[PDB]
Design a protein around this ligand. Structure first.
Ligand code: ACP
Ligand code: CA
Lengths: 123, 876
C-alpha cells in the first residue's frame, strides 16, 4: 500500500513564493489522478491543481496562472510552486492520489495528513 | 420596497427596475452598504424581561403563598406578611436568574448557527446571512431551504414550498414564475417558509418588517413554551402535598379550637405551617435543574430548541440515525459507472468540481466519444434540480455528484438544451424521478423522457436496454448481471443509482448504473462504540439498498458480523405485534420510506423506549417530529430539519449526543434530593405542632420561627440541592424509566426516618427545658435552634441519596455551603440581635447550650450516613 506525506508548508508573506511537496512511498507512475485540495474553515474543500492521465494539467479557476505543479519519478514526490499569494487564498492543503482500477469496486483513494499555510495582510 | 400584491401583479422587469436589481449579477458591495444605511438589517426589531419576571408569580403555589400573605395583611400580622413575601421574592428571583442565564446561553449558542441563505452579489454566489439581505438582492432557493425574505421569483424550474408555518395548509403549493394578475401569490415566495423541492431564483422585495407575513413570526417569537411534562407532574405533586398538609392543618385548627387555645395564635401558627408545607420551591427547583441542564449541554455544543428534551435525554436508549447526512459526511461523488452494454468507467476526482477525468479501459472520454457513457451522463445531468455555482452545491448531494460528473465529462451544457415541460419529481415513496423534454435546437424530435432512481423502481419501468448503440428488448440475463453489479457496488459502499431514457413512461431504455461514494463521517465510529458500551442501541434506518447500508454500518460497527437487517417492504408485510418483537434485534433497516421510518419509530416507542432520531433531508422531518427526540446537524443540515428538529448539534459530532444524554440523567436525582429534604422537614414541623396541640403542651415553635424554617427549607439552603453536582455512578446507571416515580418507597422511608429523628430530638429538648413547669423564652430558643440545626444536618444528608457525605466533601457544592453559612448566621442573629429576639420571642443561649445542640443535631446526619453505608453494603 502507498503512504502519503506532505511537507513544505509554513508562514508566508504576500507577494512571496512558496514551495510544497507530497511524497508517496511508491513510485508515481500509474496514478491517473493526483492533486492538491484547499480546505478552509467555513467552506467545503476546493481543488488546487492536479495532473491527468494524458499529461494534461488541471488548475482551479481562482488560482489559475499562478500555481504550478510538477512530477518526477526519480524523486517520486510531486512538487508545487505558488507565487503572487493573497490573504484570501490561504488555508490548509491536502494532497490526494487515485490509482486506476476488473471485478472490484473499492476506490483506490489515498489522502495526506495535510500542511497548514497561513497568511496575514501587509503592515 | 414593494408590497407582495404589487410585486405579484408587476412583471419581472418592472420589479427589477423598481428595486434596481441586477438579476444575473446582483447588488455590489457599495449598493448593499448604501441600502443597509437606510433599510437596515432583516431583523424583526427587538424581542419582556419584566413580563418574564411577573410570569413566575402565576404559579399556583406562589399564588397560594400570596393568598396567605394577603390573609396576614387583612388579619393584620406585619411580620408574617413580610416573611412570606420575602420567601416568595427569593425563590422567584432564583428561578428568574437561572432562566435568564439559560436563555442567554441558548441565544449565544444559536448565534453560532444563524439563519442563512445563498446570495449572488458581486457576480459570485456566496453563503450569506438572511439578516444581511437588503431589498433588490438576488437570492437562489434550493431544496430544503428556508426563504430568507419575500422573494419575487423570476426562475422556477420546479418549486414546491410548504405554507403550513404561514397559511395553515400542510399541502405544498407549486410556484409559477409568470406574473399573476390582481395566500394565492403563486409567484411570490414569502419569508420563512420552506422549499420542499426543486430550485428557483428571485429578487427580495422586502426587509425587516416589510414582509407580508411577519406578524406570525412576531407571534412565534412571543409564543413562549408550554410547561414540561415533568413540570406539570411536579405542579400536581406540589398541589397534592399542599392539600394533604392543609387537611392536617385543618385537623390542628379543629383540635386547637375544641381543646381551647388562643384562636389568633392558632390562626397565625396554622398560616405559617401552611406556608411551610406548601412546596413553593418544587416547581422552582425543577425549573432550575432544567435550566442548568440546558447550560450543561450548551457547554457541550447542543442547541436545545425545546425544553421537554431535557427530561427525556436521560431516558434515551435507542438512536435511529440515517445513513445519508447523519452517519455519512454527505459529500457524495460518482466514482464508478457500469454501462448497460457492459463497459465500465472509473471516474476520478473528488468534490463538486469539473476537474476529474472519466477513464474507460485506460482511455479518457470527453463529449460523445462513447455513446453509452455519454447518454448515462446526459440523463444524469438533465434530470436534476441541482446547480454548482462557483464551486458551491445548491441542490441535493447526489444530484450535485451527477452535475459534477457531467461537468467532468464536459456535458454540463446539455442542461440548458432541454425544455422541461413535464416533471415527475422525486419523492422518497416513489424512489425515482423523471422529466420529459424536447431539444431546443431540434423541436421535431419526440418528447424524450429522462429518468433516474433506485435500481428496482427504475428497471420496473424500463422495457428495453442499450447494446452497442442499438435498442434491444430487456432480458432476464441482463437484469441478473445488472443486479449483480448493483449488489457488488453496494458491497463496496458505493451508493447506486439507475438511469434510463426513452419516449413516454413505461417504454424506457436502461442506460446504466452510477456508483456514488459517500464516505462515513469522521469520529462516528468512536461515538457509536462509546454509545453501545454505554448501554445505548443504534439503528440505521435508510431508504437505500441493503448492501450500501450494511457495508457502511459494518464499517461504523453498529452492524456486527452476525446481525439482522430488514427491508421496508417486509415491515409493510409484518403486523404491529411481530414488528414490536423483532425491531430491537434488527441493526440496519434498508429501503425504508418515511412511512416505514415512522413505523419503526412508533414500534420502538411501543416497546417503552425513548427514541432519538438523528435525521437529514426534507422528507424525514415528519419522522424527526414523530421521534421523542429529533436531532439535526449544525453545519450540514437543511433548514427543514433544523426547523423540525428538537436538538441541533452545532459541531456535527455524535459524541454530543452521548454528552447530552449524560447531562440529562441527574436532574431526577437532584429533584429527589429537594423533595426528600423539604418533605422530611415539613413533616417534622407538622408532627411537632400536632403533638403540641393534641397533648396540650405549649407550641415548641411560634409563627415567625416556622416562617424562618420555611425560608430555610424552600430558600437557598433547599434550592442549593438542585444545584448539587452529579456523581459518576448515576451515569453508569441504565436509562431512567419514563415514569416519574419521584416518591419512591425508599425515599418515603428515609423521609419518615429523618422526620421521626427530628421530632424525637426536638421533643426531648422541649421536655427537658419544660420540666420546671415554666415556659421560658430560653425554652423556645433552645427548641427553635434545635430544629434549625436539625434542618441543616438534614440538608447535608440530603445532598446525596447513596454517596457518602465525607467522600463528597463540604466544599463540593459551594451554593449549599454559602446557604448553610447564611442560615447559621441568621440563626445566631435571631438568637442575639435584641430586635430579632423581640420579634421571634427568643433569649440568648450560652456556648455550652449551642455545643449540646450541635452534638444532638449530629445524630440525624450520623443515622443517615450509617443507613447509606448499610444499603451500600447490601447492594454489593
Ligand atoms: N434526486 C434523486 N433522484 C433520483 N433518485 C434519488 C434522488 N434522491 C434520492 N434518490 C434515491 O431514491 C432512493 C430512496 O432514497 P430516499 O430519499 O428515500 O432516502 P435516501 O436513500 O436518498 C437517504 P437515506 O436512506 O440516508 O435517508 C435511494 O435509491 C436514493 O438513492
Ligand atoms: Ca413552603
Amino acid at each position: 500500500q502507498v503512504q502519503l506525506q506532505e511537507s513544505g508548508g509554513g508562514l508566508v508573506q504576500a507577494g512571496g513564493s512558496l514551495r510544497l511537496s507530497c511524497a508517496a512511498s511508491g513510485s508515481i507512475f500509474g496514478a491517473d489522478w493526483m492533486g492538491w485540495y484547499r480546505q478552509a474553515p467555513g467552506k467545503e474543500r476546493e481543488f488546487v491543481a492536479g495532473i491527468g492521465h494524458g499529461a494534461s494539467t488541471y488548475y482551479a479557476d481562482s488560482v489559475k496562472g499562478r500555481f504550478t505543479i510538477s512530477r518526477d519519478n526519480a524523486k517520486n514526490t510531486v512538487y508545487l510552486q505558488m507565487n503572487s499569494l493573497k490573504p484570501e487564498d490561504t488555508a490548509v492543503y491536502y494532497c490526494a492520489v487515485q490509482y486506476t482500477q476488473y471485478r472490484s469496486y473499492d476506490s483506490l483513494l489515498y489522502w495526506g495528513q495535510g500542511t497548514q499555510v497561513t497568511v496575514s495582510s501587509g503592515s | 420596497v414593494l408590497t407582495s400584491k404589487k410585486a405579484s401583479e408587476l412583471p419581472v422587469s418592472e420589479v427589477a427596475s423598481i428595486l434596481q436589481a441586477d438579476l444575473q449579477n446582483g447588488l455590489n458591495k457599495c449598493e448593499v452598504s448604501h441600502r443597509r444605511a437606510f433599510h437596515g438589517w432583516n431583523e424583526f426589531d427587538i424581542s419582556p424581561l419584566w413580563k418574564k419576571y411577573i410570569s413566575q408569580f402565576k404559579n399556583p403555589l406562589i399564588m397560594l403563598l400570596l393568598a396567605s400573605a394577603v390573609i396576614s395583611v387583612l388579619m393584620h400580622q406585619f411580620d408574617d406578611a413580610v416573611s412570606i413575601t420575602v420567601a416568595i421574592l427569593i425563590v422567584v428571583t432564583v428561578a428568574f436568574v437561572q432562566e435568564y442565564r439559560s436563555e442567554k446561553s441558548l441565544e449565544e449558542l444559536s448565534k453560532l448557527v444563524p439563519p442563512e441563505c445563498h446570495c449572488v452579489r458581486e457576480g459570485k454566489l456566496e453563503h450569506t446571512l438572511a439578516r444581511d439581505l437588503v431589498p433588490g438582492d438576488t437570492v437562489c432557493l434550493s431544496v430544503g431551504d428556508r426563504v430568507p425574505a419575500d422573494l419575487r421569483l423570476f426562475e422556477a424550474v420546479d418549486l414546491s414550498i410548504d405554507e403550513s408555518s404561514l397559511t395553515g395548509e400542510t399541502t405544498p403549493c407549486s410556484k409559477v414564475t409568470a406574473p399573476q394578475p390582481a395566500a394565492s401569490r403563486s409567484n411570490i415566495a414569502f419569508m420563512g417558509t420552506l422549499v420542499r423541492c426543486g430550485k428557483a431564483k428571485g429578487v427580495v422585495i422586502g426587509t425587516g418588517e416589510n414582509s407580508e407575513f411577519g406578524e406570525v413570526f412576531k407571534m412565534m417569537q412571543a409564543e413562549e413554551a408550554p410547561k414540561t411534562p415533568l413540570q406539570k407532574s411536579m405542579d400536581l405533586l406540589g398541589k397534592q402535598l399542599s392539600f394533604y398538609s392543609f387537611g392536617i392543618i385543618g385537623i390542628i385548627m379543629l383540635v386547637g379550637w375544641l381543646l381551647g387555645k388562643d384562636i389568633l395564635e392558632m390562626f397565625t401558627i396554622s398560616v405559617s405551617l401552611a406556608v411551610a408545607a406548601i412546596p413553593e420551591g418544587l416547581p422552582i427547583v425543577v425549573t432550575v435543574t432544567l435550566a442548568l441542564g440546558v447550560m450543561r449541554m450548551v457547554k457541550k455544543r447542543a442547541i436545545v430548541k425545546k425544553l421537554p428534551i431535557v427530561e427525556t435525554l436521560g431516558c434515551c436508549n435507542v438512536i435511529c440515525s440515517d445513513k445519508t447526512g447523519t452517519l455519512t459526511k454527505n459529500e457524495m461523488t460518482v466514482t464508478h459507472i457500469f454501462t448497460s452494454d457492459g463497459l465500465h468507467a472509473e471516474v476520478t476526482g473528488v468534490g463538486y468540481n469539473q476537474f476529474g477525468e472519466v477513464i474507460v479501459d485506460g482511455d479518457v472520454v470527453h463529449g460523445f466519444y462513447n455513446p453509452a457513457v455519454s447518454r448515462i451522463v446526459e440523463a444524469g445531468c438533465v434530470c436534476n434540480d441541482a446547480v454548482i455555482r462557483n464551486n458551491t452545491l445548491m441542490g441535493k448531494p447526489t444530484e450535485g455528484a451527477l452535475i459534477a460528473l457531467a461537468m467532468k465529462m464536459g456535458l454540463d451544457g446539455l442542461q440548458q438544451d432541454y425544455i422541461r415541460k413535464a416533471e415527475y419529481p422525486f419523492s422518497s415513496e416513489q424512489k425515482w424521478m423523471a422529466v420529459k423534454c424536447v431539444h431546443r435546437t431540434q423541436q421535431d424530435r419526440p418528447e424524450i423522457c429522462f429518468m433516474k432512481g433506485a435500481y428496482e423502481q427504475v428497471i420496473k419501468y424500463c422495457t428495453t436496454y442499450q447494446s452497442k448503440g442499438q435498442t434491444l428488448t430487456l432480458t432476464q440475463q441482463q437484469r441478473d448481471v445488472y443486479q449483480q453489479e448493483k449488489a457488488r457496488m453496494g458491497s463496496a459502499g458505493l451508493r447506486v443509482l439507475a438511469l434510463a431514457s426513452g419516449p413516454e413512461l413505461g417504454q424506457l431504455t436502461f442506460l446504466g448504473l452510477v456508483g456514488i461514494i459517500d464516505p462515513p463521517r469522521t469520529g462516528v465510529k468512536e461515538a457509536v462504540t462509546t454509545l453501545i458500551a454505554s448501554g445505548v442501541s443504534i439503528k440505521m434506518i435508510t431508504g437505500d439498498s441493503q448492501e450500501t447500508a450494511v457495508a457502511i454500518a459494518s464499517r461504523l460497527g453498529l452492524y456486527s458480523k452476525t446481525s439482522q437487517s430488514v427491508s421496508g417492504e417486509e415491515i409493510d408485510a409484518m403486523d404491529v405485534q411481530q414488528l414490536s418483537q423483532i425491531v430491537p434485534k434488527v441493526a440496519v433497516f434498508y429501503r425504508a420510506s418515511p412511512r416505514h421510518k415512522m413505523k419503526i419509530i412508533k414500534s420502538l416507542q411501543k416497546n417503552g423506549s425513548v427514541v432519538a432520531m438523528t435525521g437529514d433531508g426534507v422528507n424525514d422531518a415528519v419522522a424527526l417530529k414523530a421521534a421523542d427526540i429529533g436531532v439535526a446537524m449544525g453545519q450540514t443540515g437543511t433548514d427543514v430539519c433544523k426547523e423540525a428538529a428538537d436538538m441541533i448539534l452545532v459541531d456535527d459530532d455524535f459524541q454530543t449526543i452521548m454528552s447530552a444524554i449524560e447531562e440529562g440523567k441527574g436532574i431526577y436525582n437532584n429533584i429527589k434530593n429537594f423533595v426528600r429534604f423539604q418533605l422530611s422537614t415539613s413533616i417534622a414541623a407538622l408532627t411537632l405542632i400536632s403533638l403540641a396541640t393534641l397533648m396540650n403542651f405549649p407550641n415548641p415553635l411560634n409563627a415567625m420561627q416556622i416562617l424562618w424554617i420555611n425560608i430555610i427549607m424552600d430558600g437557598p439552603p433547599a434550592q442549593s440541592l438542585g444545584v448539587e453536582p452529579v456523581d459518576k455512578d448515576v451515569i453508569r446507571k441504565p436509562p431512567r424509566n419514563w415514569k416519574d416515580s419521584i416518591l419512591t418507597k425508599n425515599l418515603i422511608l428515609k423521609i419518615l426516618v429523618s422526620s421521626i429523628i427530628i421530632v424525637c430530638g426536638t421533643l426531648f429538648v422541649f421536655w427537658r427545658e419544660l420540666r420546671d413547669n415554666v415556659i421560658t423564652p430560653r425554652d423556645t430558643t433552645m427548641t427553635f435552634t434545635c430544629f434549625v440545626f436539625f434542618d441543616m444536618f438534614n440538608a447535608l444528608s440530603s445532598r446525596s441519596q447513596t454517596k457518602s457525605v465525607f467522600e463528597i466533601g463540604l466544599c463540593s457544592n459551594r451554593m449549599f455551603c454559602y446557604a448553610v453559612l447564611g442560615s447559621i448566621m441568621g440563626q445566631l442573629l435571631v438568637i442575639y440581635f435584641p430586635p430579632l429576639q423581640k420579634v421571634f420571642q427568643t433569649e440568648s443561649l450560652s456556648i455550652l447550650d449551642l455545643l449540646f445542640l450541635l452534638g444532638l443535631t449530629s445524630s440525624v446526619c450520623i443515622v443517615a450516613e450509617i443507613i447509606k453505608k448499610v444499603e451500600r453494603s447490601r447492594e454489593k
